[PDB]
From TrEMBL, chains A, B, C, D:
Binding site for Ca(2+) 2: D178
GO molecular function annotations of the record: identical protein binding; metal ion binding; voltage-gated sodium channel activity
UniProt-annotated binding residues for Ca(2+) 1: T175
UniProt-annotated binding residues for sn-glycerol 3-phosphate 3: T162, L163, G164
This protein's UniProt keywords: Calcium, Coiled coil, Membrane, Metal-binding, Transmembrane, Transmembrane helix
Keyword flag Transmembrane: yes
Protein name listed in UniProt: Ion transport protein
Transmembrane segment boundaries: 12-31, 43-66, 78-98, 119-147, 193-218
Record organism: Aliarcobacter butzleri (strain RM4018)
Lineage: superkingdom: Bacteria
The keyword rRNA processing appears for this protein: no
Topological type in the membrane: Multi-pass membrane protein
Cellular component GO terms, alphabetical: voltage-gated sodium channel complex
Length: 219, 219, 219, 219
């Protein structure tokens, strides 16, 4: 039977059947958005939803026998596993994000279409040659975040009161989002020299990010 | 008579005449903006406005006798057709945006003058090498738009209460516009972990976009 | 006498004597900024200014004898000339920006120092390649600015009430500056479909702009 | 004794011992952020701090013997000196920023780990071929910062009342932060033509910055 299923699973129709479900269940989830639609077709969809989870667990179970250890060593497969696994955790007990994280399964469209896998892989492959910079930056943030917590969090504890808060605020300044009226102008009303802290920060963090981009435009 | 008009249509003077009307009718539409001007010389304008549309339909009719099927397989010719057609629909009545969409005829300046054509073509021609990425993103937005609608739309239904609104808000965050004081900081007053949702979103979307930019430079 | 002065003008002293005044007059203009400093040494620096203005006319005259027609065909000299003329229009009458345009002379440091000219020239020489795009865009803006004036101007005259206002607001949206909370969201409280107008606009304008940037990477 | 310590200092254990301290002290400085943690274990980690600071001077004192004048001509070594030296200035007197500047020691993880060193060097090495542009801009700013101080600082002293404030506001405009609603729309309520000052400014500064980035994708 091994070769029987290995011919069922490895079949085009099998694959094309899965993709057809994903696009369908994907459509169905944009409908579960409507409060109106749920009051008219909620059950239609909730069963349709419970159905697909099996078909996908059936699929994932087959796929494992046909592949054994080769499966748990495949990124795309591992993914599909974990995503389907999340959707298996019962509706009620635990966190309620798990109900929401179910929609992560639409990323199977990525996993189950080679044209997607290409672009995704092409993207990810750039990350290794960025880790040195990414590490640098994180170290940088961490140092400034600490300085900021102890420079401004007594008078400005919403923004800088905690090391985590400073991280977020510093992130916000790095995206250049409402950084002067929204953050540094207020701070100067108490700390006139705060610009000595945030302008260099902006220079460094911006410089780094141009390199990181230009780094990518070479490799 | 074919070869008569074929020489009229293909004549330079024909083209230059058209290009002259466009830059003329263009200047007219900018004057039609002044409420003062219209109280003064509106009639002068509005009739001059109808005239141009006739000439341009005459022209478009001629250009069809001289090209037949080759016409309706030409983007630029199709454009002009679909643009002139709009401006032919009477001033009435259901949607009055049609009166406004008339100004799209000034894009004939692009269509008639080469070099413009050149640049527009060079711009457009970059698009197909991006579609794989665009589709990836659109799928991304769709997934997060859904997660957001059901994570935040009950307390925050201006921003997230509907799939469309979430699309809009997620777009706004992608342009990095007022994203932290304007949207995520509020949201954290109720949902402290909302940064777990938007910081990753920002990273992905930003990352993706840098690649897309660089992807263009490859070509 | 021609060759006598032609040896004075061409002299390293003369040229460096000028650069020396510019750096001096520049320092003095930032000093003229301090309301306090003017109450102490205002008349010093007021004379010192007219002094430099003579020396600079004396120079520009000598420079003309030595170069004649060649001088009025030099960008840097033409500039230097025009920036000195502005500083000569009496400290009164007409407009009083002329008192302020006098600070434009410190751009002589760009002229009087090579390398600077190198960089300014390197920068400028990129423009001609851009003009096809810059024309396309300007035509683009002009079309959309019209549509906006006549779509939002009656209810939103501060932002769109006049062709110029719409130009200004569209620019502000192009820089992605407070475009959604500050403009489109208000607009949608009256015109729910306004997103149909500004999202495409942003896509275009951002797309076009990336290409233009990538154009300057064709070198 | 020279060769003895020249073999201790130059040892792998020495380096990996120092790095182990940094990552340890670095963790300790994030914990000194928690006001809670300090009412409990503040004493432990305050002593732990002076301990590391001794070890770091011992280490720095050694390293100088083994290197002499070669040490003071090492960027990376000079740094470590300066940063350890700052942590030496007594926890009193002068300013309290010195206490905060102590956290700069965590940059030793950069100085004392290669790859980091490599990455930091790669970044810094791009700077020299930017100095001309940086100089151009810094000159540009200065001219406009002056022009703005005297065009807007009487009516708008918070933003432009002083050369420095104009520098600050002009920087903020350069990062495109809340530039139109936050600064220029207000300004046009008194100075309708102020757009003639900030739009050209934005073009120039943006243009230049695209080149500076394009430069780094040449060199
Ligand atoms: C893995 C999946 C594969 C692709 C799935 C494609 C599905 C596209 C259509 C989904 C249908 C959901 C739309 C519907 O929920 O919108 C209704 C609500 C308003 O209704 P409501 O106000 O709640 O009721 C009164 O909200 C509406 O007002 C707004 C409608 C928003 C439509 C957004 C269209 C998303 C297209 C994504 C294309 C991705 C292709 C890769
Ligand atoms: C690409 C190069 C530059 C970008 C990456 C390097 C710079 C790091 C940027 C990311 C900054 C993290 C964003 C920020 O939300 O982190 C803060 C969180 C919040 O901690 P928490 O105290 O719970 O939040 C309190 C404040 N609240 C409730 C208002 C948020 O708690 C933080 O402590 C989390 C720290 C996680 C940083 C991990 C860096 C991984 C880089 C991505 C690959
Ligand atoms: C790794 C590369 C990046 C390097 C940059 C990192 C260092 C940045 C320096 C931070 C600038 C200071 C920011 C801020 O002003 O600090 C706030 C505190 C308190 O200022 P304070 O004047 O005491 O405020 C009065 C407090 N009050 C009203 C409640 C009585 O203290 C200050 O206000 C006191 C004023 C200090 C100004 C002089 C600081 C110069 C440091 C420049 C860089 C040092 C060498 C690396
Ligand atoms: C190729 C198609 C045709 C070429 C377009 C060139 C025609 C430009 C002339 C249009 C004149 C529009 C100005 C006029 O309507 O005034 C509008 C308002 C004042 O009106 P208002 O205050 O109501 O009158 C009282 O405010 C005005 O003062 C502001 C006007 C801003 C000038 C906009 C010119 C943009 C140049 C477009 C170049 C694109 C061609 C490639
Ligand atoms: C490069 C990567 C490009 C990223 C692709 C996704 C970005 C597109 C975001 C479009 C977004 O502006 O959609 C807004 C509308 C709003 O739906 P709707 O509820 O009708 O609008 C009324 C709600 N209001 C008044 C608060 C907005 O949403 C619509 O109702 C339906 C959603 C339209 C999706 C368009 C995506 C096609 C990709 C074309 C490129
Ligand atoms: C390419 C995909 C990668 C991108 C990431 C995918 C999505 C990540 C999940 C986003 C996190 C959601 C943030 C959350 O604050 O949203 C609101 C929910 C609502 O549930 P709720 O329990 O009502 O929140 C607290 C209730 N309250 C405010 C009334 C006290 O509040 C939450 O339930 C709070 C509890 C969440 C704890 C942390 C969640 C861990 C998820 C991290 C990533 C998941 C695996 C990839
Ligand atoms: C080509 C022309 C010459 C080259 C540039 C060299 C000139 C630089 C020094 C200018 C001196 C002006 C400084 C002084 O006005 O600052 C006073 C005001 C406070 O005055 P105030 O509060 O009114 O007095 C009471 O406010 C001050 O606190 C602000 C001080 C900011 C000074 C920033 C100088 C930027 C250097 C530009 C370098 C150009 C490189 C080519
Ligand atoms: C690459 C990107 C290319 C950029 C495309 C064009 C960007 C245009 C920049 C926006 C300029 C905008 O300030 O123009 C407004 C003015 C006249 O407005 P106006 O109503 O007179 O101003 C008073 C009203 N106020 C206070 C609300 C503005 O100006 C006139 O209405 C017409 C504007 C002429 C645009 C100049 C285009 C040449 C590009 C330079 C190279
Ligand atoms: C490169 C060229 C790209 C072309 C795209 C640019 C032109 C797109 C037009 C933008 C759509 C209209 C924007 C905005 O909604 O306009 C306002 C009008 C009037 O709104 P209205 O619904 O009359 O509400 C008035 C409310 N009241 C009575 C209380 C004052 O609102 C209209 O009623 C909207 C009604 C639906 C409009 C649908 C038009 C989309 C198709 C046009 C695109 C085809 C050619 C590209
Ligand atoms: C050279 C040194 C490298 C070694 C890195 C050390 C790893 C970080 C451990 C520091 C522990 C910080 C946690 C603690 O301070 O909590 C602060 C608050 C909690 O509220 P809290 O007020 O502290 O308690 C009440 O808020 C916290 O929950 C925020 C937690 C944010 C953690 C961000 C960690 C960034 C990773 C550093 C990456 C450096 C790699 C080179
Ligand atoms: C590279 C790309 C282009 C960037 C170059 C353009 C220059 C950007 C620097 C802008 C930052 C200027 C600074 O924030 O302004 C403040 C200082 C001191 O003035 P001050 O009035 O004391 O500021 C305190 C008053 N407050 C609290 C209301 C702001 O202003 C002083 O005049 C200091 C001036 C320092 C600027 C020179 C930086 C050297 C080049 C950067 C490397
Ligand atoms: C090499 C690169 C150089 C870059 C170009 C430099 C740009 C400089 C242009 C300055 C624009 C002026 C902005 C602003 O309007 O300045 C304020 C003045 C005075 O306004 P004002 O008319 O007195 O308003 C009334 C004041 N009130 C109510 C208190 C009585 O407003 C004046 O009335 C302005 C006069 C109308 C426009 C005349 C300026 C256009 C000249 C453009 C620059 C010449 C070539 C570089
Ligand atoms: Ca912003
Ligand atoms: Ca903003
Ligand atoms: Ca705001
Ligand atoms: Ca606000
Ligand atoms: Ca921005």
């Amino acid at each position: 039977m091994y070769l029987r299923i290995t011919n069922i699973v490895e079949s085009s129709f099998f694959t094309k059947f899965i993709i057809y479900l994903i696009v369908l269940n994907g459509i169905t989830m944009g409908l579960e958005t409507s409060k109106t639609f749920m009051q008219s077709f909620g059950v239609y969809t909730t069963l349709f939803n419970q159905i697909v989870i099996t078909i996908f667990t059936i699929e994932i179970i087959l796929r494992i026998y046909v592949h054994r250890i080769s499966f748990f060593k495949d990124p795309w497969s591992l993914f599909d596993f974990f995503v389907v696994a999340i959707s298996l955790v019962p509706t009620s007990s635990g966190f309620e994000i798990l109900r929401v994280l179910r929609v992560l399964r639409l990323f199977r469209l990525v996993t189950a279409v080679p044209q997607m896998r290409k672009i995704v892989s092409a993207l990810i492959s750039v990350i290794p040659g960025m880790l040195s910079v990414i590490a640098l930056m994180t170290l940088f943030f961490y140092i400034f975040a600490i300085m900021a917590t102890q420079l401004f969090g007594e008078r400005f504890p919403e923004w800088f009161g905690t090391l985590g808060e400073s991280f977020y605020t510093l992130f916000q300044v790095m995206t250049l989002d409402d950084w002067s009226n929204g953050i540094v102008r207020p701070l100067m009303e108490v700390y006139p020299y705060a610009w000595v802290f945030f302008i260099p920060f902006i220079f460094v963090v911006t410089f780094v990010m141009i390199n990181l981009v230009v780094a990518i435009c070479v490799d």
